[PDB]
Structure formats: C-alpha cells, structure tokens
Design a binder for this molecule. Structure first.
Ligand SMILES: OC[C@H]1CN(CCCc2ccccc2)C[C@@H](O)[C@@H]1O
Ligand SMILES: OC[C@H]1CN(CCCc2ccccc2)C[C@@H](O)[C@@H]1O
Lengths: 810, 810
C-alpha cells in the first residue's frame, strides 16, 4: 500500500504464502478449519523468523572471521515490546507479508495485536536498552545484549474502582517464537561459601551452584542484513540439588526463583537479597561467556582491545570485582595488571541523581552471599583512597566522601562509587544531567579524574518510533525527501523548506487527525470510553512518580473544570486529557495519585455543564504496545518534572518525532530539544535548576502559594472537603498533607506559570495552520534524538569502534 | 540392511536428507560446522515428527466424522521410553532414515542413544500403559491416554560405594520434540473450599483454582496410518494467584508443584496430600475434556455408548465421585440416572493384592481438600450398603467388611471398594491373580456381583519388545514366516515346524551370541566392566522389593561361590549374574539389598580362584532404554517372586519373546507362560500358592531351614560375621534378622528347590543344541502375551468396541 513498507513481488508473496501454510500444518499442527487468529499469528511469526536465521548465522560467522572488538551491553532490563512488525520493517518484508496474508483472507494488523509485549523492563531505562540494541545492529557493531530472561515481566495493570491492581505478566504462556534456548552453553554460577587462603592465592570454596541457561533472541539491523544477539540467562538448579527425595526436588524452586520475576519498582532501590542474586547471576554468567569467546579468538593485555563492557546503571556493577576475581584468582594475573585491564574494559552510565535510586548494599549481605567479592571491593577501596590521599593531601573529609564503603548504623557499599573507580568512562544521559553530576554528586570524582566524565544524550530508534507506529507520517515525509532519513534522521532538517508548503501542512494535519480517529476508535472498541476526536489530545504517559509531577497536571485539569463551572457559556478549547502509567506496587503515594486522576474523571466526565469540552481519562496498563498507539495521536506532550530531576526522558523525544508540541520545564533532554527546535517552538515554563536551588536555600513554603493564589486555594479546599470523594471525604488527606507540608518537588511553585503557559497552548490550537507549522518545525529538528546518533557517540568516544552502514551479503 | 525395517527408496531418501538439513538450519539455527551429535539427533527427530502430523490431523478428523465410541485410559504413569526408533518402526521409515543419515555421514544408532527416556513411570504399571497405547493405535481404536506431564520423571540411579544415590531426571532440559503444548485448551481445577446447600442442590464454593494445561504427544499405530493422542496435564497458577507483590509471584510454585515430580515408590501407598492433589488434578481436567468432546458430537443416556473410562489402578478412582458431581451438581441429573451412567462408563483394573499398595485415604484429607467429593462418597457407600443388606440380610460383618468407609483410629476411604462399587467391570492382570481376587480380598464383592469380575492377562507390544530391540531375531523369523506376525503374534506358532531345522537352530543361537557380544561391549564402553560373553547370562531386572526376592538370587550366587571355593578345580558352567532395578528412596531394606548385591560382587569378582567362572554385576539405572539392551542378551530370566504375590509381571514376557529361558515360581503370568510353552520347557520350582497358605496356617519358622540346610547355615554365618563387609562386620545384621525372624516372603522355604532347579539349568546350558531347541519352543508359544491380544479382549469384553487392522488413507 505505502512506499516505506517495501516491495510486494510475485515470487516473494507466493513463497511467504506456502511457508505460512507449512508452519500452520507442521509447526502448529492445525488446519484452516480449526485454526484461531492466535494460530495465524504464530504461523506468520514462524514464517518471518525463518528469514532471520540465515542472516543470523552468517552475521555470527562474519564476527568469528573478522574478529572485531565486541561490545557487551549489560542490563537487568530490556523492554522489547512486540517483535513481529519490527522484524518485518527491518527486513523490508511488511508489504509482502501484508499481501500474502490478504490473499490468505487474513488481516495482518489483527494478527499483530495478538502478540504479547516482551515486558522485561519498567520504563525509560529498559526501553533505552531496547532502542540501543536496534541502533547497534543498524550501525553494524558486533554487539551483544546480556540480561535475565524473567519468567514474569512488568505486571499487567488493572484499574478497579479507581485503584491499581497488579496481575502477573505470564508472557511465555503461549510460547516465544523469537527465542532459541541454548542449553548446551549452560554455565555455573556460585553463591555463598567462604574464602580460603593458600600458598598460591585465595580460593572461594563450599559454594552453592546455580546453573545459568542462555536463550538467544535475534536483533535485526535496519535493512543491512546484520542480525545481532540478545542473550538472556535463565536460572536452573543442578541435578544433584539438595540430593526427603520429594522435598529436595520441590526445593529446586529456591534456586530457580532468581530468574522468576522483574522487580517492578522502576529501580527505586530496595536492598533485597533476591535482587542482589539477580545482579550477580547476570554478571557471573555473562563474564564467563565473554572470556570464553575471547579465548576462542593467556595474554589479557589485548582483552580491552577486543572487549568493551557497558554497565547500564549500577545494577551490573559487580562485573568490576567479578572481572578482578577471575583475572586474579583464576587466571593468576597480578593485581595491578588485572586492574588496568578491568578499567580499560568497563564503562558506566548513570541514569539519575535522585538518592532513592542509588544502590547502597549492606556489607552483611555481601559478606554472606559474595564473601570473595567483598574482600576485592575492600582492596579496590583502599588503593583508590590512597590515590585520593596523594592527590589531595590532608583532605580527610574528601576521603570519607569518596569511599566506596559508607560507615554508619549499617555499613554499606556505594555501587556508584565502585563503578566510577573501576571504569574508564562515566556518562550522564543528557547535557544538563551530565553537568549536574560533575557539579554535585560526583564532584569529588570529577576533580580527581576529569577525563572520565562524558555526556551521551539519550535517543530513540526511528524505526519503532516513527516508521512502525506512524506509517502515515513516515510516508508523507518519504514523498518529499526519500527514505534515507530512516537510518539518517538528521535528514528531517530538509523538511524546514516545506514549512510554508500548503500541501504539506494539510498532509501533516491530516495524518494527525487520522491517528486521533484511530485511537478514539481503539478506546471504544477495547475500553468502551467515548472521546471527542476534535479536542486537543493532552497526554502525559510515563511511570507514576512524584518527581514527574502528575499532580501538577491534576491541578491544571481541576483549574479548567472550575473555570468552566464559573463561566459555563464562555468558549474554551476542548481537551481530552489522558494520563497513564504504572505505579510501583508498594508505593502508596503513587497509587493515591492514580486514584485521584480517576476520581477527577468521575466528576468531570459526568458533569452536563462541561459536555464534551473536557474529558479526563486514565490510560490503563501503559506499556510499549500502548505507547505506539497513543504517541502518534497526541497533540500536546506533558514533560513537567521539577527542573533537575528527570535525567533525560525519552518519551519526550517520541512525542517530538510524532507531531506533538511539548509543554515542559527546562529539565533533562527538554533543554536540548528546545535548543534544536528553537525556544519559540516549545512551551517552556517554570523554575530552572538555579531557581530550584534558590528556593531550597531560602526554604520552600507551600503555604505562601496557597495564601496568594485563590484558584489554588479553591482546589485544595475541594480536595480536603471531599468534593472528589463524597462517600470518603478524607480520602485525599495524605495528598493534601504532602502538598502543603513535605513536597520535595515544589508542585505549587510552578503552578501559576504552568496554567499561564497552558493558556498559550490553547490559543495556538485555535489556529490550526500555525499549530501545524510549529509541529513541522519540531519534527524537522528532531534528528539529534535518534539512538543512531547516541550509539555512534558511544562507539567513537567510549568503545573505540567505528560504526558502519555497509550491508552484509544477503 | 534388513527386511523388517522397510524400504529405502530413492525419492524418500532424497526428501529425508533435505528436510534434515532444513531443520538443522531453520529449526536448530545451526550449520554443519558447529553442530554436535545432539543437534543431529534433534534434526532427525524433527524430520520424523513431520511425517506424523499429517496422519495425526486426519486421524483426529476421522474420529470427528465417524463419531466412534471413545476410550479414555486414565493413568498417573506412562513409561514411554524413547520415541524416535519406535516412530520410525511404526511408519516404516527406519531403513530410509538409516540410508539418509549414512549419506550425510552420520551413524543413526549413535543419534538414537542421545534421546532421553520419557520416564514418567516406576516400572510394570507405567510400562503396561505405554504398551497399551501402542496396541490401541495398532488396533484402530479411538483411544486417548490421559495423565500428568511430570517435570521430573523417575530419578536417575547412581551407585556410590555400593549405595543407591538419587538424582533428578531433568528430562525436559533440552526440550521434547514429540509434544505439542495446547495452552488454548487449558481447563480450571478446583481445590479446598466448602459446600453450600441451596433450594436447587449443592454448590462447591470458595475454591482455590489451579489451571490444567494440556500437552499432546502422538501415538502411531503399526503401519496403519492411525495416530492417537496421549494428553498430559501440566499445572499452572492463574494470573491473579495470590493477587507483597514479589512473594505472591514466587508463591505460584505452590500451585505448580502438583505436576512437578513423579512419586518414585512404585506405588507403595504413601498418604501424602500432594499425591492426592495429583490424583484429583488428572481426574478433574480429564473429565471436563471428556464431557466437552462428548457435547461437541443434555441427553446423557448415550454417554456410556460414546465413552469408556478405564481406571488404571485406584489412582484415578476419584473419577467416580467427580463424574457424579458433574452430572448431579452441574448437569442436574437425578442421582439414580447419574449413577447408572457412571457405572456403565467406568471400569477398574486391579494391579496387586499386596496391602502396602492399597490406597486408603484419611477422611480428614478429603474433608479439607475435596469436601463435596467426600459427601458423594458417603452417599455412594450408604446406597451400596443398603444393597448389600438386602442381598445378605442380617450379615452385619459383611456390611463392615464391604464398606467404603473404614472405621478405626483414623477413618479412611478404601479406594478399591469405591472402584468396584462404581464400575461395571473389575479385572485382574493374570488368571491366577484374578482368581485370588475372587477368592480372597474381593470375595464379598464377587458374591454380590459375580458378573463384574473378569481377567485380562497382561501383555507387551511386539514392536518395541522384539522388532525395535532385537532386529536380528525379528529378521531370522521374518525369513521363514514373513512379516505378518508383528501385528499378529500368534503366527510365531509356525516356528514350531523349525525346531528340528539345523539352519534355524544355528541362526537363533547366532542372534543370541551377537546380542551378548554387543551388550558385553556396551558394559565396557559406558561402565568399564569386563564380562565373559561365553558365560550364561543370568539376569534379574525389575524394581527392588522383598516380594520379588532378589535375596533368594543372592543366596544362590553365594552358594555357587562357596561351592567353587570348596572344589576349585572342578568344572562349573560359567555364569554372569546380572541384577538391576531401582529402590524407592525411603525403602531402607531395598537399599540394603542393593548394597548386598554390590558387596557380593566385591568379593566374588576379585577372587583369583573363581577366575571368569562367576561374575556378579549390579546393573545401574535400570530403565526402558536399558531393558531394550539387556533383555535381548539374556539366557536366563529370573522370575522368582513368592507364589501369590506378583500379580502378573511383564518383564517375564519380554524375556520369553527374546530367546531366554525362564526360571520361576508358579506366580502371576509365569503360570500361563508355562502352560503355553509346556512345563517341560520351563524351569518351574518352589511352593505353589496352596503350599504358601499351608505354611502360613502352620506358622513359618525360618530357623527350621537354617538348622537343616548346612549350605544355607554357612551363608547366614558369612553374612552375620562380616565376610562380605570386613570393615563393617555388622552391616547386614538387618537383612539376617529379617530373614531369620520376620520374612513375609519365605526366602528360605524355596531355597533348596531353587538351587536344585538352577543345577538343571546349568546342565541344559552344557548342551547348546538342546538349550536352543527349548528356546525355539518358548519364542514360538509367546504369542498370547502380545498386548494386541490383551487390548482386543478389553475392547470386546469391557469397552464394547471392535478392533480393526484396516489402514487409514496415507
Ligand atoms: O536513561 C533512561 C532513563 C532513566 N530514568 C531513570 C529513573 C530512575 C528513578 C527511579 C525511581 C525514582 C527515581 C529515579 C530517568 C530518565 O530521565 C531517563 O530517560
Ligand atoms: O499390571 C502391571 C504390573 C503391576 N504391578 C504392581 C506392583 C504394585 C506394588 C508396588 C509396591 C509394593 C507391592 C506392590 C504388579 C505386576 O505383577 C504387574 O505386571
């Protein structure tokens, strides 16, 4: 149907059809008379999968022949989403499969909806890893993603009476056609035990063994015939485990629980033993695999020339002492040489400055679980502090500030300090974030080793986040500038010469309207909710946290409702306000905010005076597949975190690429986004980082704003008195109390400027032509935010490898 | 190479080769340069599997069209063994695959050794179910095997210092190519809860739900294009199970433990809750599946015309009250009609008279786990006893003897009594066993309902147990009488006219010698043990239990050793004595017997005076795959249980078919075997059932035999004093004590006649021509013991269906 989706040739369509029928018969053991849509999905998935394996085998053979430097990306999360459409896109198979399935009497889009998300992540961090894998393959890097194959990914969110309910994400129930189990490459992982010292070095003995079984998933590059590997470990008990008999077999679960479930806390730090086990499990198995592959190319001098290890946050920080353990205890390298190799091999990406996310493990846990690793950490610390002492003689407080060991009630290990010490490069994820790191939390380390500190502004893959989810926009763009931009997103700048083009303006607005209509229909078909598709689609989708200030959005929504109730017969730009995102199950306040949003909906959506001028919808079960639906339909992107808190954001970039305007604070990547588009083309409001600092030094008093802003006072009075909860008048007392007395994120401080800025949004929306022209200026300058750019920078500035757009032979 | 293995045509060989290469590339994601033998096995398995599915789909379509009466065989065990060779044999693909793999530069027999046994059974009962499935498909019956897909089958047995060690049988580690998961037909199973009574009947409420997920495995008939289904249930927790969050997900294991592990006790009764859960789980899911299939053909009058349920032992006895529950509580049939349907549908096979195997469940377990079922059982009992009371007025002790409820310290339910009450047919598994049932343990029930009681003598499939494991013998037989006997084993009678044929005699003895050489080589290659292949292969392989009297064999072995030590320079027929079998992990005496066997080996195998005249080997990890190796190599089959204890035996039949002579008591099927061959062609010895009874009435005094048999006295003195355990002199005190004071199985009573009979064996073995002629007379009369005969009798006399040898279209 459309150009960007590839050719639908006669030979290819005929071949896909017969392979589809073959899989339905031989693979699924079905015939057309008993087959359900699910069976048809699987037949197609298997057909498309076959096209990957040829390329998969020769890519890995190619890496064996050419022996390039290998990139190992270690993450506890890979938020992959659905694989079918992505695979078709990257292999140029989408139109052919569309045709083949059409001729079989099937709708492909219907089949695509059957696939479960691979939900092996929480949000931003996990999705970044997934975008990164796509870009590394597209740029021809010999890269491997290493993680854990969780049996249960992020929970499915149900809303019951306005309250979040969790249910297990049993994503493997029907099987996963994309993975290949590799039980032959199973590796042992050691836990507990004790350390023995001998004539010739230390020995870790009396350990409990858990087996790590790998599952490989292919990662296709964009139309370059490169197929990389994501290897995920599954925990398996050894066959002599605990070997009454029956109980010993049943107790195998204790070992296998390691890979059972993803911690759903968006990596808020919870010092749980099971989480530490997960962290070591991925690290220990991965490093054995890395060394094995290296030896099959004694002299570890060349190790850093052939291996790069990227630590995604501090979660795999145990790679540093585990690499030391292997080189010193097993390979018998001396400490100094082993350390040199370790530092040159490892690099660390920091993802946030917020203290609640910082991993600080109690020493007593490491003592019991990983006794050899604790000894190595102590030695690293000692030698690191000796360097600090020599560089800044007599500076005793620097010594305690920089120590990897934190003293106090319970001694802890600061994993971020470990990572900086043991890595040759440390990067933040947006310019403002990387600057804050050097100025605040890692200032001491920057003073000692300034060369280590870098920035790598985050990005998103234009394959999934434009071509896949918004084919209509990808197509109208391709018509004017060709298809090259899909792997060279800087080419969207060429769209600036179409900002005064009346045909293009009409087409952009047309694509948006079609997306909005399609999403409005989806909401009715699957959730029975009615929305006006002519209203401004105002959307905030992201994990529920206080720093993201969903509550600030709530205050604006209520302001609009109160203003309508005051002057009902006055014209207001109609809005559909959509908010979605999961709360961590044990995060009481986050769950209360969800309830508040639904409670506002209950009042606003049923007021006859309001009509269809204002609607408030909580988007249930926000996840990658839903993101691909809601983002192309958005008009306004809410990016309103307190300045200095959102390290980067990536959702912001997704909205920019897809034709939404942004209302946001000068935080994270919002700053670079506004810089690229021009500030006149963004709706910036609120305190900057410097203003936040000034307020903290003076002392934040929320009562001041309440006293001086009558519209704000009314809302708080409404919340307190039970306007939004008639049967439970006191329901929101905790929210009000937090807002009034202990708000870390200064919601009231930005309220006035936010409401004012929102008025400016509504004014522009009244002028469709000028709205769309500003949209075009956003889309046209979104090029910097491709993960191809991000990964090219990692490659050249950290990993020391050259990206390549050159095809491998088909 | 050989005739019985089918054709190796040019088109078929070329097609197998390309499909082999296709699976290696697309399915295994490998190429020849990285592939291991395991990969080659899987490529072949997938290639052969493809040939099944076409036939599998049309068989099940055929059953849907013709709507025949369906046979449901319910068992907690199916001891399937390996599937690859069996599939090739039944599809006539063996020579073609042999050729195809040879041309690819691969040895097929090597690939066949890679397959794990499907070890979902303990021994005789599980293997019977597996032979039965093969025969039902071969005889064209619309039959379904229903069981549990255990994650862990029977443990692997390791011998360490003469002691049995157990390790988990992780049979699914590398995947199972034969099964097809059917998550779409997942069914809910209910546990716990309570019973509510309403205006319109009882309701079972507040239950915990466990999901039953089916896996289907194909069962090919012999060369008839019939492919039946074995459906095995896997336990799955529902997604809202227990829904802190992490713990709720981890606690899913509690529900899923139901299908985790096979109880390895050879069905010695252990009243464990988990076992009861397993029993209900298979029953509840199976019956829902049966009713579903029946409704997709209101009027349950025709239910018994379209459905037969065979209860394999009492393990699935809960089918009776579960069927009543469904018909009464859910379908709202009246009791009397529901009961009529239940009785006409169900039939029960008893497998033993030994009390330790009898299932008698504590009422308090059923009260908590299955409260509605207990109420139904009580009602069945009440109505049953009213019938007893009317038939035998005033016979109060009959009432208590026949009750399904046993009173005492703890009240129990007698599951065997439930089965007789609720079934239209009850059968034993050999003529002597079925007679004992009517005369002893079920005498009261036989008096009430004589028509219910039947015999169905067990059998074995001649496909697995001749053609597959002994191709050399199958071939020399086919040369004389053709191939028809493979599905018509009565034709072996034609071999009687070759008993004086010098060429045939030479060939039979040649096949045996080749088998013995092959097995002697196997023992060295895989276990580094040296045996003389010119010795008499004296073998006893079967589960270790006191009733099977492995100890009687041990006493003979020691007698031979003592006789050699007394007269070293006197000629004795050389023997290799092989004993193998697993002991239940908690069965102390069985484990001590294993240790004794190895301890005897330690003394006998290293005595220079003995030389290679006597060897004692314990065969490690006895299982189906090992049976297929050792049975064709055997000269003497030990079947020496105390008369009246071994209900049938099936190992005995396997040895008879494969050219071994039998030394045995008049027990189980041994009686019918001797009757078929003629007693002159069997080595029968020892007490008959009647002699055992006489001894019990008089009182068994083991001391009498010790006092009067000096050779026996010497052995006991040797055991007691530490001759076979120098470093632990008292090691065998428990064995001696049991033999002397509490031997339920009268080992000493049969000692003299056994030793004497063994002398007669050795005498015949000295005359190779006369040994072989007697062998020919055994093989020639083994026809009755085909499971095709057994199943034809079940079909006609219990299930009311006609077997068919007619082909389905290919
Ligand atoms: O780098 C990927 C994302 C990583 N996240 C990490 C969020 C960590 C966090 C989690 C809970 C509470 C506070 C902080 C921040 C975003 O700005 C980034 O875009
Ligand atoms: O019917 C299959 C077999 C069933 N077995 C059941 C053995 C049951 C048992 C298990 C432990 C202790 C005593 C008895 C007896 C054999 O004679 C039969 O051949």
């Amino acid at each position: 149907q459309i150009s960007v989706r590839g050719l639908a040739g006669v030979e290819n369509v005929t071949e896909l059809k017969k392979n589809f029928n073959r899989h339905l018969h031989f693979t699924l053991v079905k015939d057309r008379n008993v087959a359900t849509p699910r069976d048809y999905y699987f037949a197609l998935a298997h057909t498309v999968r076959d096209h990957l394996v040829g390329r998969w085998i020769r890519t890995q053979q190619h890496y064996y022949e050419k022996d390039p430097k290998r990139i190992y990306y270690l993450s506890l999360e890979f938020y992959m989403g659905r694989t079918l459409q992505n695979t078709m896109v990257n292999l140029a198979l989408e139109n052919a499969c569309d045709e083949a399935t059409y001729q079989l009497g099937l709708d492909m889009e219907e089949l695509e909806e059957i696939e479960e998300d691979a939900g092996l992540g929480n949000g931003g961090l996990g999705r970044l890893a997934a975008c990164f894998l796509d870009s590394m393959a597209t740029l021809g890097l010999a890269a491997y993603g290493y993680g854990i194959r969780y049996e249960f990914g992020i929970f499915n969110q149900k809303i019951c009476g306005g309250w979040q309910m969790e249910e297990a994400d049993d994503w493997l129930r029907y099987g996963n056609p994309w993975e290949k189990a590799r039980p032959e490459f199973t590796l042992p992982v050691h836990f507990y035990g004790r350390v023995e010292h001998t004539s010739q070095g230390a020995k870790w003995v009396d350990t409990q063994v858990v087996l790590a079984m790998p599952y490989d998933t292919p990662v296709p590059g964009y139309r370059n015939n490169v197929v990389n590997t994501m290897r995920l470990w599954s925990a398996k008990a050894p066959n002599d485990f605990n070997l009454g008999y029956i109980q010993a077999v049943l107790d195998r679960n204790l070992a296998e629980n390691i890979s059972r479930v993803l911690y759903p806390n968006d990596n808020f730090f919870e010092g749980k033993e099971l989480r530490l086990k997960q962290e070591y499990f991925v690290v220990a198995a991965t490093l054995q695999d890395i060394i094995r592959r290296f030896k099959s190319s004694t002299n570890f001098d060349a190790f850093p020339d052939k291996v790069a290890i990227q630590l995604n946050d501090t979660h795999p920080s145990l790679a540093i002492p585990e690499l030391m353990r292997v080189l010193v205890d097993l390979e018998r390298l001396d400490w100094d040489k082993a350390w040199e190799v370790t530092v040159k091999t490892c690099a660390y990406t920091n993802h946030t400055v917020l203290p609640e996310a910082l991993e600080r493990w109690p020493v007593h846990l490491l003592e019991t679980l990983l006794p050899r690793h604790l000894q190595i950490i102590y030695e690293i610390n000692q030698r690191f502090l000796n360097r600090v002492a020599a560089a800044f003689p007599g500076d005793v407080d620097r010594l305690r500030r920089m120590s990897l060991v934190e003293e106090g009630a319970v001694k802890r290990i600061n994993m971020a300090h470990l990572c900086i010490a043991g890595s040759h490069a440390v990067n933040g994820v947006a310019r403002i974030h990387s600057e804050i790191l050097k100025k605040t939390i890692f200032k001491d380390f920057y003073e000692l080793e300034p060369h280590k500190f870098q920035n790598k502004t985050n990005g998103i893959t234009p394959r999934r986040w434009l071509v896949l989810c918004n084919p209509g926009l990808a197509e109208i763009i391709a018509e004017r500038i060709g298809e090259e931009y899909i792997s060279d997103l800087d080419q969207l700048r060429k769209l600036l010469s179409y900002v005064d083009d009346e045909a293009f303006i009409r087409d952009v607005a047309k694509v948006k309207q079609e997306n909005k209509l399609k999403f409005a229909a989806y909401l009715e078909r699957e959730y029975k909710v009615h929305i006006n598709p002519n209203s401004l689609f105002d959307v905030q989708v992201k994990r529920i946290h206080e720093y993201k200030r969903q509550l600030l959005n709530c205050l604006h929504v209520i302001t609009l409702y109160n203003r309508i109730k005051k002057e009902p017969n006055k014209f207001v730009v109609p809005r559909t306000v959509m908010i979605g995102g999961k709360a961590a199950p044990g995060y009481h306040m986050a769950k209360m905010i969800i309830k508040l949003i639904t409670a506002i909906g209950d009042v606003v959506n049923h007021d006859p005076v309001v009509g269809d001028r204002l609607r408030v919808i909580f988007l249930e079960n926000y996840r990658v597949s839903l993101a691909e639906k809601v983002i192309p339909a958005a008009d306004l992107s809410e990016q309103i975190s307190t300045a200095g808190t959102e390290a980067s954001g990536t959702g912001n970039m997704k909205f920019m690429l897809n034709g939404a305007l942004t209302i946001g604070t000068m935080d994270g990547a919002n700053v670079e986004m506004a810089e690229e588009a021009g500030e006149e083309n963004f709706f910036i409001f609120g305190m900057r980082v410097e203003d936040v600092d000034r307020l903290d030094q003076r002392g934040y008093n929320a009562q001041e704003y309440y006293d001086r802003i009558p519209e704000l006072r009314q809302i708080i009075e409404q919340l307190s008195s039970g306007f939004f909860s008639p049967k439970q008048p006191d329901l929101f007392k905790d929210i009000v109390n937090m807002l009034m007395h202990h708000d870390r994120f200064k919601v009231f401080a930005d309220y006035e400027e936010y409401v004012k800025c929102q008025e400016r949004v509504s004014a522009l929306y009244k002028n469709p032509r000028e709205w769309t022209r500003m949209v075009i200026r956003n889309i046209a300058t979104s090029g910097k935010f491709s993960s191809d750019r991000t990964i090219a920078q990692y490659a050249r500035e950290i990993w020391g490898v050259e990206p390549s757009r050159q095809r491998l032979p088909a």
